[PDB]
Amino acid sequence: QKAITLTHRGMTLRGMEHIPEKSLDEKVPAVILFHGFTGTKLEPHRLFLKISRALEKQGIASFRFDFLGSGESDGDFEEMTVSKEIEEAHAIVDFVKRDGRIDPSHIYLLGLSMGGLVASVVAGERPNDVAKLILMAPAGNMYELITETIRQENIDVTAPYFDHGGNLVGRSFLEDLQTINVFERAKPYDGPVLLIHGTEDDVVPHRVSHLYEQLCYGSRATVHLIEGANHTFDGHRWETEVIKTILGFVS
Fold first, then answer.
1. Which DSSP letter does residue 202 get?
2. Domain count, the chain
């Protein structure tokens, strides 16, 4: 693997690429992984890196950036919004499509939770660029999720930011999120979709993967439940099943 960078609107996104041996023989498929809210390109217990490594062993490249304001990338988290991440994700797809090592007919998008929201929107907006889509615990109904939290925590939405445990969430994030109908913008994508969701996910309930199936994908979606797993699959058994399900879906 190798650290990589991508400039967007004058700021630097920082990431990793994993390029398999097979790229010498031929242009290879690639997975682009988009991380979740307050997450990073690594995700808990190295989940995204472990996926990259398993994909690489199967001859599949991968690319994963920290969004601006997250992880190692330029910017502050308070300025992040979902619309900005969508724009950055589109720029990352552009970047992988410019990579002569990558088969542009076999680019797969993967997103975790809010990154799955972003992935599902990007795929809906350029379906012909996206051969397969992987949604991990996709937070389709995040507005309801953030709505539910401001009621429980009595969050004052006039504030310029909300301090989410040391991650500052700007007011612009809420205003922007309220304008995004996720299931509508995702609906046009007709490729195969894998939804992976932990059955004990308290952050995004696993019924939401059914919602994506009912509202966006229908018979093209494969819903794969991980029995007992929490939101980020914080368990070796759970993570092994997650990784193998992904590899089975892209092989």
1. S
2. 1
Residues paired with residue 195 on neighbouring β-strands, in sequence order: 135, 223
Q: Is 197 exposed, middle or buried (0-12, 13-18, 19+ CB in 10 A)?
A: buried
Do residues 139 and 117 touch, judged by C-beta distance below 8 A? yes
Single-letter code of the amino acid located at 238: W
Q: Tokens at residue 89, please?
A: 């994700």
| C-alpha of 128 from chain center | 19
Region for residue 233 given its phi and psi (left: phi exceeds 0; alpha: psi -120 to 50; beta: otherwise): left
- Residue 10 gets the label, from left (phi > 0), alpha (psi -120 to 50) or beta, of left
Amino acid identity for residue 240 in this structure: T
Q: Could you tell me where the DSSP H helices lie in the chain?
A: 47-57, 82-97, 114-125, 142-152, 171-177, 182-186, 207-212, 236-250
- Nearest one of 208, 210, 213, 214 to 193, comparing CA atoms: 213
Q: Compute the residue count for the chain.
A: 251
- The position carrying tokens 């930011």 is 161
- The identity of residue 88, as a single letter, is E
Residue 209 CB burial class (10 angstroms; 0-12, 13-18, ≥19): buried
Q: Which two tokens stand for residue 211?
A: 């919602």
Tell me which residue of 249, 212, 239, 49 sits closest to 138, measured CA to CA: 212
Residue-number span of the structural domain to which 189 is assigned: 1-251
Phi, psi of 161 (to 5 degrees): -150, 165
Interstrand relation of 161-164 and 167-170 (parallel, antiparallel or unpaired): antiparallel
Q: What CA–CA distance (Å, rounded) separates 221 from 212?
A: 8
CA distance 125 to 127: 6
